[PDB]
Scaffold this active site. Structure first.
Site, PDB file in Angstrom:
ATOM      1  N   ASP A   8       0.885  -1.145   0.000  1.00 47.41           N
ATOM      2  CA  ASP A   8       0.000   0.000   0.000  1.00 47.41           C
ATOM      3  C   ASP A   8       0.942   1.219   0.000  1.00 47.41           C
ATOM      4  O   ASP A   8       2.157   1.076   0.251  1.00 47.41           O
ATOM      5  CB  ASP A   8      -0.830  -0.004   1.280  1.00 47.41           C
ATOM      6  CG  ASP A   8      -1.987   0.964   1.219  1.00 47.41           C
ATOM      7  OD1 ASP A   8      -2.370   1.492   0.140  1.00 47.41           O
ATOM      8  OD2 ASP A   8      -2.576   1.175   2.276  1.00 47.41           O
ATOM      9  N   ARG A   9       0.384   2.402  -0.267  1.00 49.34           N
ATOM     10  CA  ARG A   9       1.181   3.620  -0.256  1.00 49.34           C
ATOM     11  C   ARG A   9       1.020   4.421   1.044  1.00 49.34           C
ATOM     12  O   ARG A   9       1.890   4.369   1.929  1.00 49.34           O
ATOM     13  CB  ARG A   9       0.883   4.476  -1.493  1.00 49.34           C
ATOM     14  CG  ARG A   9       1.990   5.439  -1.778  1.00 49.34           C
ATOM     15  CD  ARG A   9       1.524   6.579  -2.663  1.00 49.34           C
ATOM     16  NE  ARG A   9       0.752   7.555  -1.880  1.00 49.34           N
ATOM     17  CZ  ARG A   9       0.058   8.566  -2.394  1.00 49.34           C
ATOM     18  NH1 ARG A   9       0.002   8.745  -3.721  1.00 49.34           N
ATOM     19  NH2 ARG A   9      -0.597   9.390  -1.577  1.00 49.34           N
ATOM     20  N   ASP A  10      -0.106   5.105   1.190  1.00 47.84           N
ATOM     21  CA  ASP A  10      -0.331   5.914   2.404  1.00 47.84           C
ATOM     22  C   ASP A  10      -0.400   5.023   3.613  1.00 47.84           C
ATOM     23  O   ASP A  10      -1.228   4.094   3.663  1.00 47.84           O
ATOM     24  CB  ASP A  10      -1.630   6.716   2.287  1.00 47.84           C
ATOM     25  CG  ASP A  10      -1.651   7.572   1.089  1.00 47.84           C
ATOM     26  OD1 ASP A  10      -0.955   8.607   1.081  1.00 47.84           O
ATOM     27  OD2 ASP A  10      -2.309   7.138   0.108  1.00 47.84           O
ATOM     28  N   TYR A  19      -5.524  12.356   2.416  1.00 49.57           N
ATOM     29  CA  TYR A  19      -5.596  12.721   0.994  1.00 49.57           C
ATOM     30  C   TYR A  19      -4.300  13.352   0.482  1.00 49.57           C
ATOM     31  O   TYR A  19      -4.335  14.435  -0.114  1.00 49.57           O
ATOM     32  CB  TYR A  19      -6.748  13.698   0.704  1.00 49.57           C
ATOM     33  CG  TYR A  19      -8.108  13.199   1.101  1.00 49.57           C
ATOM     34  CD1 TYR A  19      -8.825  13.822   2.114  1.00 49.57           C
ATOM     35  CD2 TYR A  19      -8.687  12.104   0.453  1.00 49.57           C
ATOM     36  CE1 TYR A  19     -10.087  13.358   2.489  1.00 49.57           C
ATOM     37  CE2 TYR A  19      -9.939  11.636   0.812  1.00 49.57           C
ATOM     38  CZ  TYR A  19     -10.634  12.268   1.829  1.00 49.57           C
ATOM     39  OH  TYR A  19     -11.872  11.796   2.194  1.00 49.57           O
ATOM     40  N   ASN A  51      -5.466   2.243  -3.144  1.00 51.15           N
ATOM     41  CA  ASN A  51      -6.774   2.853  -3.351  1.00 51.15           C
ATOM     42  C   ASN A  51      -6.584   4.356  -3.198  1.00 51.15           C
ATOM     43  O   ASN A  51      -6.004   4.834  -2.195  1.00 51.15           O
ATOM     44  CB  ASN A  51      -7.807   2.425  -2.285  1.00 51.15           C
ATOM     45  CG  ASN A  51      -8.379   1.000  -2.492  1.00 51.15           C
ATOM     46  OD1 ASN A  51      -8.075   0.286  -3.473  1.00 51.15           O
ATOM     47  ND2 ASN A  51      -9.211   0.581  -1.525  1.00 51.15           N
ATOM     48  N   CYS A 104     -16.180  -1.164  -9.105  1.00 49.58           N
ATOM     49  CA  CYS A 104     -15.108  -1.756  -9.886  1.00 49.58           C
ATOM     50  C   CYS A 104     -14.605  -3.040  -9.233  1.00 49.58           C
ATOM     51  O   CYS A 104     -15.090  -3.455  -8.176  1.00 49.58           O
ATOM     52  CB  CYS A 104     -13.987  -0.758 -10.021  1.00 49.58           C
ATOM     53  SG  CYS A 104     -13.207  -0.362  -8.422  1.00 49.58           S
ATOM     54  N   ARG A 107     -10.951  -1.824  -6.513  1.00 49.90           N
ATOM     55  CA  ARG A 107     -10.971  -1.199  -5.167  1.00 49.90           C
ATOM     56  C   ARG A 107     -10.853  -2.251  -4.094  1.00 49.90           C
ATOM     57  O   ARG A 107     -11.793  -3.037  -3.909  1.00 49.90           O
ATOM     58  CB  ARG A 107     -12.268  -0.393  -4.960  1.00 49.90           C
ATOM     59  CG  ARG A 107     -12.322   0.354  -3.626  1.00 49.90           C
ATOM     60  CD  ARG A 107     -13.389   1.492  -3.680  1.00 49.90           C
ATOM     61  NE  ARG A 107     -13.734   1.913  -2.309  1.00 49.90           N
ATOM     62  CZ  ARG A 107     -12.996   2.704  -1.513  1.00 49.90           C
ATOM     63  NH1 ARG A 107     -11.818   3.210  -1.901  1.00 49.90           N
ATOM     64  NH2 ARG A 107     -13.433   2.964  -0.286  1.00 49.90           N
ATOM     65  N   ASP A 133      -2.170  -1.344   6.033  1.00 47.57           N
ATOM     66  CA  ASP A 133      -2.598  -0.960   7.383  1.00 47.57           C
ATOM     67  C   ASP A 133      -4.077  -1.172   7.596  1.00 47.57           C
ATOM     68  O   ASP A 133      -4.590  -0.821   8.660  1.00 47.57           O
ATOM     69  CB  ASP A 133      -2.285   0.534   7.680  1.00 47.57           C
ATOM     70  CG  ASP A 133      -2.992   1.516   6.710  1.00 47.57           C
ATOM     71  OD1 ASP A 133      -3.391   1.125   5.594  1.00 47.57           O
ATOM     72  OD2 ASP A 133      -3.114   2.714   7.034  1.00 47.57           O
ATOM     73  N   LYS A 134      -4.768  -1.774   6.629  1.00 53.02           N
ATOM     74  CA  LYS A 134      -6.226  -1.892   6.746  1.00 53.02           C
ATOM     75  C   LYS A 134      -6.766  -3.277   6.437  1.00 53.02           C
ATOM     76  O   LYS A 134      -6.155  -4.067   5.693  1.00 53.02           O
ATOM     77  CB  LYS A 134      -6.945  -0.905   5.808  1.00 53.02           C
ATOM     78  CG  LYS A 134      -6.723   0.579   6.116  1.00 53.02           C
ATOM     79  CD  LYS A 134      -7.573   1.423   5.156  1.00 53.02           C
ATOM     80  CE  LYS A 134      -6.911   2.752   4.858  1.00 53.02           C
ATOM     81  NZ  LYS A 134      -5.509   2.552   4.343  1.00 53.02           N
TER      82      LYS A 134
END
Ligand SMILES: [Zn+2]
Length: 182
Positions: A8-10, A19, A51, A104, A107, A133-134
């Site tokens: 993941d990125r963030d 954001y 995402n 989609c 996601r 993280d999710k």
């Protein structure tokens, strides 16, 4: 075929300020670039799967996202980390931006982005890792047959449900090379 680390990125690569879409607000988490470099040396492909529903919401534009993503790719390349793939999902079914307002199968928790990477890079999924993280990251991973599901603590607070769906929980991506070695 190659094993991969799906990232993941963030909250995994960069600090999640909410954001994030500007270069000046993009902060690499301590130790993650060194870790990415080490993971490449351990034989892994590195694939970002993110995402980005802020695009569908109109919090920032696809142009802003592309710009940041190009910057991030060059920034990593300049520090001897050559990402093998970058996948993102700009959609949300309630999106305000018409172009991106849709259901989609990219996601997360839908495994689309991981399946696409799998076919594009010929990935050995059972030998691969998903780091996020999710809960939705762990659920996308189980769907895609990713062998090891890893939560980090550098992003959103870890919920019991995310914890349930994970194999490992680490402080950060910086801890992953040692955890794999061990
Ligand atoms: Zn999507």
């Amino acid at each position: 075929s190659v094993p991969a680390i799906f990232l993941d990125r963030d909250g995994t690569i960069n600090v999640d300020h909410g954001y994030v879409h500007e270069i000046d607000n993009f902060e690499f988490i301590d130790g993650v670039i060194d870790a990415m470099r080490e993971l490449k040396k351990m034989g892994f492909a590195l694939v970002v799967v993110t995402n980005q529903s802020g695009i569908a919401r109109g919090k920032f534009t696809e142009a802003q996202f592309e710009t940041l993503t190009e910057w991030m790719d060059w920034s990593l390349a300049d520090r001897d980390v050559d990402l093998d793939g970058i996948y993102y999902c700009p959609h949300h079914p309630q999106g305000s931006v018409e172009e991106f307002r849709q259901v989609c199968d990219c996601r997360k928790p839908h495994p689309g982005m991981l399946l696409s990477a799998r076919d594009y890079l010929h990935i050995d999924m059972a030998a691969s890792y998903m780091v996020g993280d999710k809960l939705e990251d762990m659920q996308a991973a189980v769907a895609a047959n990713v062998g090891t599901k890893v939560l980090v603590r550098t992003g959103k607070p870890i919920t019991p449900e995310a914890e349930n769906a994970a194999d490992w929980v680490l402080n950060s991506l910086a801890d992953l090379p040692q955890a794999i070695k061990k």
